[PDB]
């Protein structure tokens, strides 16, 4: 009976994810062997920091990463649903129903569910990219992660998305929004109300010079130099040495005349900003302060890629050749104090619209500061789901989708004759774990809220056409309430691309586990 | 010199409360009355927070030599 114990091993990790999804969820502190503490509420990220023993668990871990890479949302829906499909199948495996027909039953039930998802769409997203329209999609993403910040973070995330998107409609050929267009930075001090939205990357380091900021002139030229600042020498070796004191005056003054001659040609071309990816010498910073050139050093090659998409600058393999064709243009750059420390940021005004933005976060709690950093990244992938593959369609969330599927699947159970009725009925019952998890973690009685959920989606209406309220979902309460509430009040919806993709992954995940009747292992 | 150093910290922040268990006891007493108007499990939970505020004057009296058992009943009586 290893197939039963294999589910029990997953059951130990099943309750771990049951404490994640929902507003009652919480991050888990993990101490790495290198002495580094990673804290995040997302369960998919936690799986990478956990040591997996049984190889059957890795099947669900590999299926969990499928949800994060493509859609990026619904990782908790894939792991929790796949764990429940094994529990409802444990009764079928024991009852004497072969696991072969159990797999065949899920394949027939999966095709019946995918056809019903198109008829469950209530509203449709027009892809207007309006600040108020993005508040409907972002609110449920921030929900079930961090409580109380859903109102403040909704305006910060939706504002940065509208900055990187151009003005277009009814065009899906050329993609626009990427996953790197939104960067998350953090600084000690302040609160969430004082946070703002920047139209470009934010640099928290020092300018390393007596020039704090440039002027207000339009279209500042920015040059990215990969070669460090120093006198030009032979690429092979070329170490400066002093044999006698006679060559000291020639080599010292030679570096002063050569560097000043190269910096003069750069300032004459109109370049007020020089980006040096490598180290900067001592004599180089002296000439840049007199010409009024801002000093910027970005050793990371990843940050230089997003900078080229904004102003249009290109890294030059040499030094002293400011080719105007490859130079970039930025409207306004300023150095302001945000969060208690003076930093030099990067933004724009009108022209040279930036394709990458950065949101500045402030707060007095260090633990909740890193949790919001991981929560915004989940909201970035939500905008990507607005593309052609069913980006506008949406389904009601907050447990309203999983409960409504029960009445439709059981209707097709008695329609299909044969032994498939056992797997079809258990496939709909497995969806009851989602409303039960939200009700159990919220302190609500199972004998109270659960029977009202079944009576909400199942009523007797004197007519053929459905009526009254089909929008009743699952409520977390937290203060007081009687029965349930309508989801249309808070406008919490789930996208079709996220829900439809999470069902196929969770179905194939449980299919692999049920198909394995034997596991061979070897000690290392 | 001592009089200036006392009002020095009061000049930086002019928002102050009465110390020595005064404010701590007033908060614990009002939350017990506010819970009486709040139905549900939150009533006994708020009363637990009001009792948790009594540890601050306790340790202050125990470390100073006073009896935390007698001062708790005598303070609430006049409170």
């Amino acid at each position: 009976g290893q197939i039963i114990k294999s589910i029990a091993a997953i059951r130990e990790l099943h309750q771990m994810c049951l404490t994640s999804m929902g507003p009652c969820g919480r991050n888990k502190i993990i101490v790495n062997h290198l002495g580094k503490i990673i804290i995040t509420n997302d369960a998919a990220t936690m799986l990478r920091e956990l040591d997996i023993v049984h190889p059957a668990v890795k099947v669900l871990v590999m299926a969990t990463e499928q949800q994060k890479i493509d859609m990026g949302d619904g990782t908790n829906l894939v792991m929790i649903l796949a764990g429940e499909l094994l529990n409802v199948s444990e009764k079928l495996i024991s009852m004497g129903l072969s696991a072969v027909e159990i797999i065949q039953g899920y394949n027939m039930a999966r095709k019946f569910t995918l056809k019903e998802l198109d008829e469950m769409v209530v509203g449709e997203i027009t892809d207007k990219n309006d600040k108020n329209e993005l508040l409907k999609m972002i609110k449920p993403v921030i929900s079930s992660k961090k409580y109380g910040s859903e109102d403040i973070l909704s305006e910060l995330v939706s504002e940065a998305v509208s900055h990187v998107l151009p003005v277009a409609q009814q065009a899906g050929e050329i993609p626009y929004f990427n996953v790197d267009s939104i960067r998350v930075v953090k600084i000690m001090g302040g609160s969430l109300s004082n946070s703002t939205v920047i139209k470009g990357m934010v640099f928290n380091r020092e300018p390393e010079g007596h020039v704090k900021s440039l002027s207000e002139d339009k279209k500042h030229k920015v040059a990215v130099f990969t070669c460090p600042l120093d006198i030009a020498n032979t690429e092979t070796k070329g170490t400066v040495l002093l044999h006698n004191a006679q060559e000291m005056l020639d080599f010292s003054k030679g570096e002063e005349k050569q560097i000043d001659a190269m910096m003069k040609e750069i300032a004459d071309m109109g370049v007020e900003c020089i980006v040096a990816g490598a180290g900067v010498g001592e004599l180089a910073l002296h000439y840049l302060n007199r010409y009024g050139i801002l000093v910027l050093k970005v050793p990371s090659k990843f940050e230089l890629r997003r900078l080229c998409r904004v102003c249009g600058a290109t890294p030059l393999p040499r030094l002293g050749a400011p080719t105007p064709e490859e130079l970039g243009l930025v409207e306004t750059v300023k150095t302001m104090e945000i969060g208690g420390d003076r930093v030099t940021v990067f933004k724009q005004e009108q022209g040279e619209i930036s394709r990458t933005s950065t949101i500045i976060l402030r707060g007095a709690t260090q633990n909740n500061l890193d949790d919001i950093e991981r929560a915004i990244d989940d909201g970035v992938a939500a905008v990507k789901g607005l593309m052609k593959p069913s980006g506008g369609k949406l389904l009601p969330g907050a447990g309203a989708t999983e409960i409504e599927l029960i009445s439709r699947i059981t209707k097709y159970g008695e329609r299909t004759p044969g032994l498939l009725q056992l797997a079809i009925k258990q496939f709909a019952v497995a969806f009851e774990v989602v409303p039960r998890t939200l009700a159990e973690t919220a302190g609500l009685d199972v004998n109270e809220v659960l029977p009202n959920l079944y009576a909400a989606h199942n009523v007797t209406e004197p007519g053929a056409v459905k009526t009254d309220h089909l929008y009743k979902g699952v409520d977390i309460d937290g203060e007081s309430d009687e029965g349930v509430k309508d989801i249309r009040e808070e406008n919490i919806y789930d996208m079709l691309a996220t829900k439809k993709f999470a069902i196929n992954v969770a179905t194939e995940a449980a299919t692999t586990v049920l198909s394995i009747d034997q596991i061979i292992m070897a000690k290392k | 010199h001592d009089a200036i150093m006392i009002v020095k910290r009061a000049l930086q922040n002019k928002l102050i409360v009465a110390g020595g268990g005064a404010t701590e006891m007033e908060v614990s007493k009002c939350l017990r009355d506010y819970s009486k108007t709040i139905a549900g499990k939150q009533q006994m939970i708020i009363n637990a927070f009001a009792k948790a505020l009594e540890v601050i004057p306790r340790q202050l009296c125990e470390n100073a030599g006073f009896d935390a058992i007698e001062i708790l009943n005598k303070l609430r009586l006049a409170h």
Binding site: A364 | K14, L31, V55
Partner: protein, 79 residues
């Protein structure tokens, strides 16, 4: 347990007073919630009960705290 140390360092930095009292208050609040777990009460309503008490406490502290400037006082007689 490192959370109590992290909030204590921020208490000594941004303020400088109440580094010891914030740990005792957070710990005593934990002891009052210990018997609530054995009864089956979930932590959701436990958090909502304390957050509601703090929300009512901030409004009460502002009423208890006496800040007066031009009313029966001045910038001098007050100090």
């Amino acid at each position: 347990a490192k959370t109590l140390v992290d909030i204590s360092r921020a208490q000594d930095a941004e303020v400088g007073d109440g580094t010891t009292s914030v740990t005792i208050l957070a710990g005593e609040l934990m002891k009052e919630a210990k018997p609530f777990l054995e009864e089956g009460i979930s932590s959701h309503l436990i958090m909502k009960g304390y957050r509601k008490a703090v929300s009512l406490a901030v409004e009460k502290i502002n009423e208890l705290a006496v800040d007066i400037t031009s009313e029966k006082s001045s910038g001098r007689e007050l100090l």
